[PDB]
Amino acid sequence: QVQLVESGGGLIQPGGSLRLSCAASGVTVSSNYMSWVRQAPGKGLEWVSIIYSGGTTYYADSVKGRFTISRDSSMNTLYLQMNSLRAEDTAVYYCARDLMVYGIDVWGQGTTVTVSSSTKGPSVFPLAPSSKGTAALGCLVKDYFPEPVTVSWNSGALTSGVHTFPAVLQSSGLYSLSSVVTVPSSSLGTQTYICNVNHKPSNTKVDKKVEPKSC
Amino acid sequence: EVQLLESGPGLVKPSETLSLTCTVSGGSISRYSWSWIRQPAGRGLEWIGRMYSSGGTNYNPSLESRVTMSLDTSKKQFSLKLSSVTAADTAVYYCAAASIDQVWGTYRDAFDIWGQGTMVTVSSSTKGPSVFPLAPSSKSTSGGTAALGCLVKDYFPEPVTVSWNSGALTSGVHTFPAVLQSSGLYSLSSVVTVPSSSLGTQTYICNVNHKPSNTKVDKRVEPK
Amino acid sequence: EIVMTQSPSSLSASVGDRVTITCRASQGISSYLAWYQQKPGKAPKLLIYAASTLQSGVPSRFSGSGSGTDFTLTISSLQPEDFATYYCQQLDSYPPGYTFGQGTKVDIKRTVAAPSVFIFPPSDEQLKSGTASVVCLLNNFYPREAKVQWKVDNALQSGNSQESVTEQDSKDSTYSLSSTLTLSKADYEKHKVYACEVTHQGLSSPVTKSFNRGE
Amino acid sequence: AIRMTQSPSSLAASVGDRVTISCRAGQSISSFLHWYQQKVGKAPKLLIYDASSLQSGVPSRFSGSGSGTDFTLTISSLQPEDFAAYYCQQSYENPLTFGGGTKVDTVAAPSVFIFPPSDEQLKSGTASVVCLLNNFYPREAKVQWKVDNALQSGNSQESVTEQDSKDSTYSLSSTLTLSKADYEKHKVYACEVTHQGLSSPVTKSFNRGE
Amino acid sequence: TNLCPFDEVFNATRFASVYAWNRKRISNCVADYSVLYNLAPFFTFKCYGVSPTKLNDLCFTNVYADSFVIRGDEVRQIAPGQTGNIADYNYKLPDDFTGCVIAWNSNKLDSKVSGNYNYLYRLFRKSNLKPFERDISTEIYQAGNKPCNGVAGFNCYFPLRSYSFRPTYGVGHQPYRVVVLSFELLHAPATVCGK
């Protein structure tokens, strides 16, 4: 069993502190180049820190003076102490075994860190089909925190033609999302369309009936 | 002790790709540089290229466009590919390794380890030999010394190897260079001189191996 | 710092195609380069190390080449399990960092498909709250590259819109995009004509869908 | 490529003699010169490295000298096991290059033996007659075939072994090949041998059919 | 009146690898400080604990001349209180190091067109090197849980790698010849004096 198991991630306010753990089996942490790599939502991989088997440590400029990498040989565990966290530190954090010229062969499953300044259920607004062969309708799941939300249509009876887009982070710090579906125009008057929005962090389940607008 | 064993086709057609492999036993692959050297008939040694366990390669510029070297650390093997082979690529091919210099340096450019070499011939079928006795008689017995042998005839390509009595008889053995006959097949003789009193007493068997055709023959040579 | 410029950002290929991805270093890094493969939600996978050496277990159709500044990753015969995102890394000690390339997404190629464009006015229920969200839908198109331009009374709007793209559909290999234009209720009531202009390879000319506020 | 030139290409010497072999590089190679000994039918063996350093287990009768362009191998007292081809190699720059080689070759007369074709070979339609010269020095020898006193010219092939590592002699075989029909037309098969160790040419023969 | 053998160290035709760095013990001689007295700008010259203009006026017990080869981006590690693959695993200088370090670009000497893989370095080691420690061990480094037993495999790698110096590389990947001069003054007769 050669694996790396991350833990310690979660939600935290800006300025706070957080400690990540990386339990190794098969690979001895104090004998390898151990690195932390993070990946913000939708962005590429960003190297954070490394600790040599001899004790030498290195840090990226964006995390110097704030992050400190460490290890406990008796636990065979890698650590990453994150202080003065900022919003841009929101990412999935991977611990990995670096072989320098031979690459990075062993990666962990990753632990998620979210840095933001309050939990909120979403407002669900209808995206009504226009009055003018196939029509599009949907739901606007706006202003919620944190991730994620799940959206179904007609309690799961409608799945063909459904597109639930990945959420975007707004400048307000709250997430926004839209889920649309395309249907034949002949059905807008005979078939009811309700989107089911589930946001467990706020204990919010909302069913919104999407109807053609009445002028 | 590190040992090197060459393997590959003994006969290739023009314009084909020669593929040779050297197998490494008895040491660490990472402490040596690995080279291929060839020796064309009537010419000196010609270095082909070198490789390191790091994947770095250096070639002879005259062969670089046709040569590829590869290292398989899992199989403990390194290989030479030579594309578009010609009659001029007919040679003995050796694998060699450089000493693991300590105080001297690292890869002291001095091939201390060599494989036995493999004959590669470029020509367009391989044919095994017939083995005939050169029987001892009064005409090959001058006083207390008699001569006997085996005639290893009509094979292609080179080489054959000959031993006597499964390697137990080495004193007085003479195995001659093969000659290319006007048929385009080789012939070779191997002889031994022995005490005349040993005729009919010692059994004399020549062990012939023609590796290109996978032909092996043990021929007993009796007087008269 | 060394800057790893990777191109193209994305490329489309069919099964059996010969794919080539290019990585360019800001300064010479000799053979200190590696190539990685990553799929959504998974950890990176080391493919090539030392610029041209194939990692154990990686299929032989992968090959790296180059030394100094220009490097190329080559998939000689693309297979279905090779549609991923690929990165190059400067796995060299100096200058710190260990930088990664911007990444190259290799999606599934098919015939060109033009998008179906729909515009959705903000709902009356949402206008009662004080915020107006106008949504523009691009349904089932290919390739991924698409440009959406909002116009408010013929004024090109930038900075107040966000986009979201679905993953390549598992049945018709098309993409779907949503664009959300957000305004205050007061600003929304200051203008009349709201439109999103969609340019795409499948469209001979930009397609525009519009509505008038209150009609 | 740095051209390496050896002189002489071949020399004959006696046991106890001092042998000297020159190797010249086309440009300065500092001390990056290595010497190899190659016995007949064997791989090369490293003798001297870095122009003057003896490889482990090499006898002190071998010595290397030189720097820049000009190098020398010296054998101070030649032994029977030293009869071999010698090669210089440069390792200053790629491609690595070898010199053309130098072949280092008391009088001993050959013992002469003759072998008629075997009955097995005759059954197959051909006749090979073999003449063996055993344990002679120097290597030069003339071997002629006579068939019912007709000198054969162009009908035979010969080859020669390695200078024996114990007694420093050579052996040689010569083969005359005929069709069975031509073999059966003649009676006396003789090989005539001329060698420095012999007072006069000698002949060994047999009569077909014993 | 023996002169300290400094020409043999700087003017050497072949240098050692960084993992097996060579050291020349120089003692009982007159030091003609001139190879380092006036050095050209293209020479990296950094002294620690002692001033170069004062070396002619000081006698030392022993002077050690360490020579090896690294690449340009690694010369910054040949200094007191430095970390990295070279400092931790190949050649370490103490925190109170008393001496000078000399380094110059040798791309015209140690770089071949087909790559000069002769120079080596150590990549893996279980712990850091003590000051002035030389480890020439080539044992298979264990990076996992299962014992290697001299088998190159998963989590079992050879601890030495090649530099592959090619002239077309950047300055940070070109070979640099380093000469570290240590000046020792222990309870002993001082014999290495200047003139």
Residue numbers in the entry:
A (entry chain S): 1 to 117, 119 to 133, 138 to 220
B (entry chain M): 1 to 124, 126 to 225
C (entry chain T): 1 to 215
D (entry chain N): 1 to 105, 109 to 213
E (entry chain D): 333 to 527
What do the paper's sentences say?
S is the major surface glycoprotein on the SARS-CoV-2 virion and is involved in viral attachment to target cells via the interaction of cell-surface-expressed angiotensin-converting enzyme 2 (ACE2) with the receptor binding site, at the tip of the receptor binding domain (RBD), in the S1 fragment of S (Lan et al., 2020). Following attachment, cleavage of S releases S1, allowing a major conformational change in S2, exposing a hydrophobic loop that executes fusion of viral and host cell membranes, releasing the viral genome to initiate viral replication (Walls et al., 2017). In-depth structure-and-function analyses of 27 potent RBD-binding mAbs isolated from vaccinated volunteers following breakthrough Omicron-BA.1 infection reveals that they are focused in two main clusters within the RBD, with potent right-shoulder antibodies showing increased prevalence. In summary, we have presented a structure-function analysis of potent human antibodies induced by Omicron BA.1 breakthrough infection in SARS-CoV-2 vaccinated individuals.
Omi-6 and -32 bind at the same site, although Omi-6 binds a little lower and Omi-32 is rotated clockwise by ∼90°. Omi-6, an IGHV4-4 antibody with reduced Delta neutralization, occupies a similar position to the major cluster of IGHV1-69 antibodies. (B and C) explain sensitivity to the Delta L452R mutation, since this residue lies just underneath the H3 loop in Oni-31 (B) and Omi-6 (C). (D) Sensitivity of Omi-6 to BA.1.1 through specific LC and HC interactions with R346. However, there were notable exceptions; BA.2 neutralization was reduced 189-, 79-, and 26-fold compared to BA.1 for Omi-8, 32, and 33 respectively, while BA.1.1 neutralization was reduced 28- and 193-fold compared to BA.1 for Omi-6 and 32, respectively, and knocked out for Omi-38 and 39. Detectable residual activity for mAb 150 (IGHV3-53) was observed with BA.1, BA.1.1, and BA.2. Structural analysis revealed binding to be broadly similar to that observed previously for early pandemic virus (Dejnirattisai et al., 2021a), although the Fab was translated by several Å and formed looser interactions, consistent with almost complete loss of neutralization activity.
